[PDB]
Amino acid sequence: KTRKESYAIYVYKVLKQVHPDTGISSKAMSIMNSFVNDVFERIAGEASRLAHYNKRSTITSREIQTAVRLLLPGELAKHAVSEGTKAVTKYTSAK
Template identity: 40%
Template sequence: MAEPGSGSPSPAEGPLVCQDPEKASSPDRKQRKPRPRHRRRRRRLGTSQQPTFAIYFPKLLKEIHAGLSLSKEAKAVLDCFVRDLFERIADEAASLVRNKRGSTLTYTDIQSGMRLVLPTQLYTYADSQANKALVKFISSK
């Protein structure tokens, strides 16, 4: 067991003094081997690290209902819903492009995919919002 006061250096060792790095006794730099550099490994996005739409939900909710917030479970459900809807629209738009033997996905293809996937009222609202965002983007250039 340690004796009380053993935390301080003993007189035989001498006091601990910080030395100037230039004056400290160290092997010559030419003799010292350089540290091996580790290669940076690319991180693979796992299921928990995939990009999500969760950062946009509070911003949108603040515009509609200022005092409300969402729980983690609600954000997860909304994220799954948005991802599923996005995949459905993208799949429909891609199949339309394949059917017309094209190689470029255009705005009209996405509009047609939205029309096929979404109900009528939701499609008209989404289309008007998309047009408004497109006009805002083009005018900001």
């Protein structure tokens, strides 16, 4: 029985974070997983293009941030950048 990976459990955790008393259906979970994969691919591809354009061989958090600012619209981009910076700072704080 093949072991197929998905974002189902993390999407569920985020859902219980925002709407504690609310479930999700299998079809909706599949749509959410597809959405996460699509956004991942878009941001990662834009970051790869950014690194290539600058003759840089590494994808850093700066490349991800610029990719996010390019892809997402105004307010969504602002808040995504805020969350990303928060997470990166919290990560570097701990070891």
